[PDB]
Design a binder for this molecule. Structure first.
Ligand code: ATP
Ligand code: ATP
Ligand code: ATP
Ligand code: ADP
Ligand code: MG
Ligand code: MG
Lengths: 722, 214, 107
């Protein structure tokens, strides 16, 4: 009763583990007794005790779920005191339990009768203590489920004679209500299914297919609910409610994702006028007196309409563009603010602002009363692409000009990172190639009416057009590779096989894992060993939609701030894709390093250190590959803690390797090969592959008589100690 | 009830209450509208147009985003894969953090208390501070991290830090977090080459009693 | 085709005729495009200007399908002085970066 210090132990049997009752020794306690376990002054838990012979005296056994819930570790000391329940008040009437599958491997869609679950729960856990938030394992029909206690209610008085409590005792007449966990696939049937937190929003029943817009549902619903929802009720009711119509919307996103359509389409949902486009940079016209004059001229029609009709005119719209440039000029911003907000302003206007830079936008222009509803439009996912392709290819499918071989799902799966404006371009390209298929125009432009029937667009037409017409923006850079990997890849020994093999064991992890959304690797080796040419050969085989190379040659003469901005921009662009891979090479030159001093740019180093440890937004993945030649210098600056792993690309260090590489290059004949083998089989070799190629090219210039002599002399001169 | 809504909105500015009231009506009145080739005001259920608690609750959770109030994204991406026990040190650290965060709320002779965590690199000392901050339950919780100052000079860093610290004097309670103090100062052992204009402000700031009773 | 870019360094004692002898090899090359960049033409220029001059020279040389650019007295270009030592870092970085960037395909 006072309390004794026991030791935690492991559950002896599975049956007792499912009972949710801590196992104790008979010499210490008795079955059915409830105790309180103390792990700290502020940590107390209540458990039901069961007696098993295998439990050593002086110790208490807990199942794995109990240890995790109570934060217990095997072997740690706890204090146990007998606990008495006040059945007059602690008796429990009803439960609300969140039930979810214990194991993901055994998830099934079969229905489960909650009424039987409650009966089994009562039949098993009768006269047992339970607390809010307790996690346990419940077995039903030879199936394991994870149960979490959500609510507890007191029992009503007996007939002869719903308080919320934190802990109580379960009895035979207690009731259990089961609710599936969030996003749970568990199917529950019966009357024991009452749940809570049932709050949502009801929206009008739209038909997106008939519109033209696909893949943008939540944004459309939210915008309609928050901006235009209060311009259709009669003017009498709005006056009674006292609402004030919104006067601004700011939609931002990449270029060409449906931003303007999302406004034009909703424009005609309500009897109203048509938007008057106004370019962002066009309003910047040289001198004042023209910019202001035009700005005034923008609202003349609205002012005249309001004067004529007062509070009965139709709504107008002004589709802005590149508001970033017009704001930060200041005169225009002040004029617009006065026109929209202040004392003299119109009540039949609604400015829609668009931009690409969300951060550069000014702060004073974003505040309740001004532009308030800020929304983002992102790239479409698989479902969006499917719907877009369905909608954009309806007219052709209606006339029976689409072959049965075309599968929309395959095209949607293949097309990755397409913005949506290009999806339209793909269909046009397919139609164009299909039409060109049948143009028998030799000699003179003519028409082949013989095969003009069924001017279809077969899978070949789509695929043939997907490689020579459309170039996605956030897509593969297919021109850089031709300049880096200039002479293929030659397997001159075991090392090349190993390094490339690693290129897989990492590239796969970044694609099939969720606990590590960022990986890094630093390739390094002696100079002229072929480092920069082994990173592209991995990034290409990685099969990633987005690839880039942040070489230092494109920035010559730049100052520190310019380099920092360029690197930040490259990384920001890379952040916006579902997958990516960014290659940064020749790190030593980025830092602007020189052995005297030493000297280097203290800002680029800090920027690089910060960037290599910043995870992207949720659900996206990244991979960074480095390349360096001076490892000790990088270790002095404490930079190898940022990188997760490193690899060592070796150099040609055996005569066999030299002979085999020369053979694979296929330049010399058999006699010269034998002579070189005889002459070089008594000395050590230390030469880079690039140096070997350059030496071979240099030596091939001599006459046939003295090619071998010149090559051997050059190799002897180049040879040096490791 | 209007009384209840005055206990779940903490550090709400004056105008954001008007914003909440305005946003609690669009959702209520957005139900009674049917569109079929044109938005048409409903007729059968036009009456009974009453705003209900559901609208208020939905607006309070996903409509108005406060300014001088608790965030929900800063300390959402820092702690990544929860916290799992592997011995005594985790329990010790959590208990010490809880004791400090209760002292800083039930004391009157020490309005300011600061604690410094440290250990070897790659040990999890930035996901054990966000947890303490999230368990603090203070209305105002900010996170000043070097991730948002890439490429800044020294003056910009000083201004940003001063503004962040100043914003914390406008609430009855405040908790603030500084991550990678070694990175703000730009330490690099080929030197050292620290910045002496940020280290002579960070020292001063950590000793500055708030205006009064905060 | 395996070595589209080739560089060679001539070194020797002072006043050994290194500066002028290379012009002979350049003339006998017969390449359609030739050019010589020397510090003599650049007197009183700032550090930021010499980098632009080098960049423009190399950009112009890139265009043709054959070229031979000669740089003389690589040391005096850096403003090197035995005391210190002292020199301009930007010029050295530009020189180091520009000596390995190959031209477009086939040039
Ligand atoms: N197995 C191979 N591994 C690497 N490079 C190879 C191989 N086979 C042929 N090469 C050729 O070697 C050259 C690699 O040189 P690379 O551009 O990587 O130089 P580097 O060692 O990175 O130079 P630096 O020290 O200037 O950074 C490329 O031309 C590539 O075609
Ligand atoms: N005590 C802990 N017990 C269990 N998991 C932990 C613990 N501390 C951290 N973690 C987990 O490990 C990861 C910690 O990564 P984190 O960014 O905090 O590393 P760090 O070593 O503290 O960082 P830095 O090197 O920048 O100081 C997170 O996934 C967090 O969930
Ligand atoms: N056989 C020769 N070889 C080289 N130069 C010669 C020869 N005979 C005469 N000369 C002359 O020697 C000079 C060599 O050029 P110059 O003096 O500019 O080179 P340099 O002394 O190496 O210059 P620097 O000291 O700046 O490197 C030219 O005037 C050249 O005509
Ligand atoms: N969600 C979508 N569904 C169908 N078509 C779309 C979608 N988004 C864009 N498009 C197509 O792409 C074009 C978008 O042009 P627009 O958005 O006005 O250019 P910008 O985004 O530069 O303003 C339209 O012609 C439209 O047919
Ligand atoms: Mg290289
Ligand atoms: Mg950290």
């Amino acid at each position: 009763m006072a309390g004794r210090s026991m030791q935690a132990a492991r559950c002896p049997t599975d049956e007792l583990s499912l009972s949710n009752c801590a196992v104790v020794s008979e010499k210490d306690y008795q079955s059915g007794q409830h105790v309180i376990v103390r792990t700290s002054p502020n940590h107390k838990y209540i458990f039901t005790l069961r007696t098993h012979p295998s439990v050593v005296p002086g110790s208490v056994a807990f199942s794995l779920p109990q240890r995790k819930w109570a934060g217990l570790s095997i072997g740690q000391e706890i204090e146990v005191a007998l606990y008495s329940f006040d059945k007059a008040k602690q008796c429990i009437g009803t439960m609300t339990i969140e039930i979810d599958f214990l194991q993901k491997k055994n998830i099934d869609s079969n229905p489960y009768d909650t009424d039987k679950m409650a009966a089994e729960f009562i039949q098993q856990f009768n006269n047992q203590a339970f607390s809010v938030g307790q996690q346990l394992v419940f077995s039903f029909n030879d199936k394991l489920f994870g149960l979490l206690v959500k609510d507890i209610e007191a029992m009503d008085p007996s007939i002869l004679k719903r308080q919320k409590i934190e802990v109580g005792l379960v009895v035979g007449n207690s009731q259990v209500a089961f609710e599936k966990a969030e996003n749970s696939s568990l199917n529950l049937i019966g009357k024991a299914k009452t749940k809570e937190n049932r709050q949502s929003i009801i929206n009008p029943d739209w038909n997106f297919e008939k519109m033209g817009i696909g893949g943008l549902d939540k944004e459309f619903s939210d915008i309609f609910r928050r901006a235009f929802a209060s311009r259709v009720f009669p003017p009498e009711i709005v006056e009674q409610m006292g609402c004030k119509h919104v006067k601004g919307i700011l939609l931002y996103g990449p270029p060409g994702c449906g931003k303007t359509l999302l406004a034009r389409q909703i424009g005609k949902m309500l009897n109203a006028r048509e938007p008057k486009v106004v370019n962002g940079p066009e309003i910047l016209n040289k001198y004042v007196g023209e910019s202001e004059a035009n700005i005034r001229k923008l609202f003349a029609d609205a002012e005249e309409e309001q004067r004529r009709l007062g509070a009965n005119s139709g709504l107008h719209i002004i589709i802005f563009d590149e508001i970033d440039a017009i704001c930060k000029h200041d005169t225009v911003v002040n004029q617009l603010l006065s026109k929209i907000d202040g004392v003299e302003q119109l009540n039949n206007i609604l400015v829609i602002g668009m931009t690409n830079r969300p951060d550069l936008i000014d702060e004073a222009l974003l505040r309740p009363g001004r532009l308030e509803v800020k929304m983002e439009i992102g790239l479409p996912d698989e479902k969006g692409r499917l719907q877009i392709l369905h909608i954009h290819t309806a007219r052709m499918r209606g006339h029976q000009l689409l072959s049965a071989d075309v599968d929309i799902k395959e095209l949607a799966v293949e097309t990755k990172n397409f913005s949506g404006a290009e999806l339209e371009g793909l269909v046009r390209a397919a139609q164009s190639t299909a039409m060109n298929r049948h143009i028998k125009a030799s000699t003179k432009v003519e028409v082949d009416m013989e095969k003009a029937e069924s001017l279809q667009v077969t899978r070949g037409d789509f695929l043939a057009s997907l490689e020579n017409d459309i170039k996605p923006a956030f897509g593969t850079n297919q021109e850089d590779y031709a300049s880096y990997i200039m002479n293929g890849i030659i397997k001159w020994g075991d090392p090349v096989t190993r390094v490339l093999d690693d290129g897989e064991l990492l590239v796969q992890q970044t694609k099939n894992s969720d606990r590590t959304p960022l990986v890094s690797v630093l390739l390094e080796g002696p100079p002229h060993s072929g480092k920069t040419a082994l990173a592209a050969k991995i990034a290409e085989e990685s099969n990633f939609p987005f690839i880039k190379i942040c070489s230092p040659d494109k920035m010559i003469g730049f100052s520190e701030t310019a380099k920092c901005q360029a690197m930040k921009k490259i990384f920001d662009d890379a952040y916006k894709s579902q997958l990516s891979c960014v290659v940064v090479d020749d790190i030593e030159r980025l830092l602007d390093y020189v052995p005297i001093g030493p000297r280097f740019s203290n800002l680029v180093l800090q920027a690089l250190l910060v960037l290599l440890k910043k995870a992207p937004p949720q659900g996206r993945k990244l991979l960074i590959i480095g390349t360096t030649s001076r490892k000790d210098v990088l270790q002095e600056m404490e930079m190898l803690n940022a990188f997760s792993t490193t690899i060592h690309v070796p150099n040609i260090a055996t005569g066999e390797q030299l002979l085999e590489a020369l053979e694979l290059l296929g330049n010399f004949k058999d006699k010269e090969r034998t002579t070189i083998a005889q002459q070089v089989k008594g000395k050590k070799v230390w030469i880079g592959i690039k140096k070997l190629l350059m030496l071979i090219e240099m030596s091939l210039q001599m006459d046939p008589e003295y090619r071998v002599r010149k090559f051997l002399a050059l190799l002897r001169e180049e040879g040096a100690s490791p």
